[PDB]
Amino acid sequence: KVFGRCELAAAMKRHGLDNYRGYSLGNWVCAAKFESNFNTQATNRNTDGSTDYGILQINSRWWCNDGRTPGSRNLCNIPCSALLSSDITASVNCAKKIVSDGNGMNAWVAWRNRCKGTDVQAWIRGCRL
Ligand SMILES: [Cl-]
Ligand SMILES: [Cl-]
Ligand SMILES: [Cl-]
Ligand SMILES: [Cl-]
Ligand SMILES: [Cl-]
Ligand SMILES: [Cl-]
Ligand SMILES: [Cl-]
Ligand SMILES: [Cl-]
Ligand code: NA
């Protein structure tokens, strides 16, 4: 599923991500935009043989099981395939554990390089929320 901007903002708020660990809704919408262009089925192979899955590009090295990432962990206790669903529950629950890990939203290299410090409120502007 490819979400619209305000549609994803609403689903993220419903699932409790708005202000989670102090990050406003606009930060989470901006991160999804540059990670996946709002497409739940996005995948991207890394140089190290791991893979990033879904609307927030969560990596199989630590967070989910794909059966093909040697020596990896599955800290979210889920198959990576659950991260590609039209229902975002699994992605949001796993993102909560990632953003709690010590480095905040800097865990997402695209949020640090494209969203951090910018006018992130623009991502939720005009949305009926
Ligand atoms: Cl957009
Ligand atoms: Cl915001
Ligand atoms: Cl594996
Ligand atoms: Cl394969
Ligand atoms: Cl594990
Ligand atoms: Cl599994
Ligand atoms: Cl959803
Ligand atoms: Cl923080
Ligand atoms: Na894994």
Side-chain angles (χ1 to χ4, degrees):
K1 174 178 171 173
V2 178
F3 274 79
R5 181 173 65 79
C6 301
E7 185 187 16
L8 179 63
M12 285 178 159
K13 188 168 158 171
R14 208 195 114 216
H15 285 92
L17 213 48
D18 129 78
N19 268 285
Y20 190 92
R21 282 273 154 152
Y23 289 97
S24 64
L25 196 53
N27 283 279
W28 293 103
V29 177
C30 185
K33 171 67 179 178
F34 293 128
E35 291 295 351
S36 66
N37 204 22
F38 302 145
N39 181 355
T40 68
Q41 304 193 76
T43 59
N44 282 299
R45 195 92 190 244
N46 303 136
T47 59
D48 75 348
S50 70
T51 302
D52 293 342
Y53 292 88
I55 48 144
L56 294 161
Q57 293 291 272
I58 296 174
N59 184 262
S60 61
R61 213 260 127 154
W62 290 104
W63 309 104
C64 61
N65 177 59
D66 70 6
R68 65 160 210 211
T69 313
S72 76
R73 297 297 291 276
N74 173 13
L75 292 171
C76 292
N77 303 302
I78 43 160
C80 296
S81 65
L83 299 175
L84 300 183
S85 184
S86 66
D87 186 308
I88 73 169
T89 307
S91 285
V92 171
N93 289 351
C94 191
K96 295 175 168 174
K97 171 176 293 105
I98 296 163
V99 75
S100 301
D101 196 59
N103 296 315
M105 283 195 73
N106 299 288
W108 285 275
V109 172
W111 173 85
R112 180 165 61 74
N113 287 335
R114 307 180 71 176
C115 298
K116 196 173 184 183
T118 74
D119 183 17
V120 300
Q121 195 284 145
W123 294 96
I124 63 171
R125 192 160 295 160
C127 308
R128 180 165 195 99
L129 290 156

